[PDB]
Design a protein around this ligand. Structure first.
Ligand SMILES: NCCNC(=O)c1cccs1
Ligand SMILES: NCCNC(=O)c1cccs1
Length: 330
């Protein structure tokens, strides 16, 4: 089997991407944030505290003939950005882009943190990291990809995120029309439950490439590119008037700037992030200070190849017995 779904930026900055997902019988379509950095599929629901719902579409398990309470199971998750959610669990039929899984754990939120409530465009998350990170207790649950894998034509999914445009998530096949050149594959560690890999180095603009190992995760659920402070300082040093602002919480730059590109290495291959991809717009409405798309990971404890990086590539998440990542230009 295969599936193919379009993913759409939630706003003009690409702060996140939403992908429609069919849950239940008859289908209830929710717009979920596909997150290769977490492993829970959770939704706003008829159980969510009413004051914490503001415009999201909810899953109502009592209206699905295939929904079953997963008795005793609860979940609770805290993300790296400080946001959180928790609740109970149903199993139900979940389809993405024509690919159906029966008996998928659908984690129903009873509580969500303010940043979820305040984002009316995201109806929940669909985790695509390794199932070892799933938070359901006392019986850990599998991701949608892990449940689908055996049925897929190839045990893979691909992320093709757009810059200020829609893109695609495919499951079970590699669309050879969607990228240029060849795909370079690189090793993955699953030891922390993430799609963790080692980049071979970086360049700033037309500068020389620096060969250096940068361990990090491929995380579609993180907006920005988070790298070591040395690398980030080298990038922003090429932008007149850029500075790290403790008050704003990262590097800012004059909105009048033309940003340089940023290149990262994948083995002997190179992915180029155009400068425009690194502009996240005014820090507040009407400001002439703009927020940078490359930020330090020093406060995180891991480097994160988020959407800024991933949207410059066609990315293969290879879930073979030994997982690997693939990157191609496009
Ligand atoms: N801070 C806004 C609410 N949190 C989110 O939208 C998340 C997306 C992916 C991981 S957390
Ligand atoms: N240098 C121009 C300031 N940047 C912007 O207005 C936007 C960034 C992303 C969408 S608009």
């Amino acid at each position: 089997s295969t599936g193919s779904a379009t993913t759409t930026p939630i706003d003009s900055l690409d702060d996140a991407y939403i992908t429609p997902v069919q849950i239940g019988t008859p289908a209830q379509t929710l717009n979920l944030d596909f997150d290769t950095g977490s492993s829970d599929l959770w939704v706003f629901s008829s159980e969510t505290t009413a004051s914490e719902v503001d415009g999201q579409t909810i899953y109502t398990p009592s209206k699905s003939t295939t929904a079953k309470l997963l008795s005793g199971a609860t979940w609770s998750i805290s993300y790296g950005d400080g946001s959180s959610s928790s609740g109970d669990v149903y199993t139900d039929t979940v389809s993405v882009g024509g690919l159906t899984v029966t008996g998928q754990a659908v984690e129903s939120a009873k509580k969500v943190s303010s940043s979820f409530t305040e984002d009316s465009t995201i109806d929940g998350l669909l985790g695509l990291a390794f199932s070892t990170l799933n938070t359901v207790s006392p019986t850990q649950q599998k991701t949608f990809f892990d449940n689908a894998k055996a049925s897929l034509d190839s045990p893979v999914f691909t992320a093709d995120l757009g810059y200020h445009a829609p893109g695609t998530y495919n499951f079970g096949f590699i669309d050879t029309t969607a990228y240029t050149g060849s795909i370079t594959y690189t090793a993955v560690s699953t030891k922390q439950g993430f799609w963790e890999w080692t980049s071979t180095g970086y360049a700033v603009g037309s500068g020389t490439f620096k060969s250096t190992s940068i361990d990090g995760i491929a995380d579609t659920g993180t907006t920005l590119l988070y790298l070591p402070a040395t690398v980030v300082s080298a990038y922003w040093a090429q932008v007149s008037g850029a500075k790290s602002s403790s008050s704003v919480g990262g590097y800012v730059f004059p909105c009048s700037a033309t940003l340089p590109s940023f290149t990262f290495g994948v083995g002997s291959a190179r992915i180029v992030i155009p400068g425009d991809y690194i502009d996240f717009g005014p820090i507040s409405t009407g400001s002439s200070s703009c927020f940078g798309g490359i930020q330090s990971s020093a406060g995180i404890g891991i480097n994160i190849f988020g959407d800024v990086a991933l949207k410059a590539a066609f990315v293969v998440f290879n879930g073979a017995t030994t997982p690997t990542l693939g990157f191609a230009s496009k």
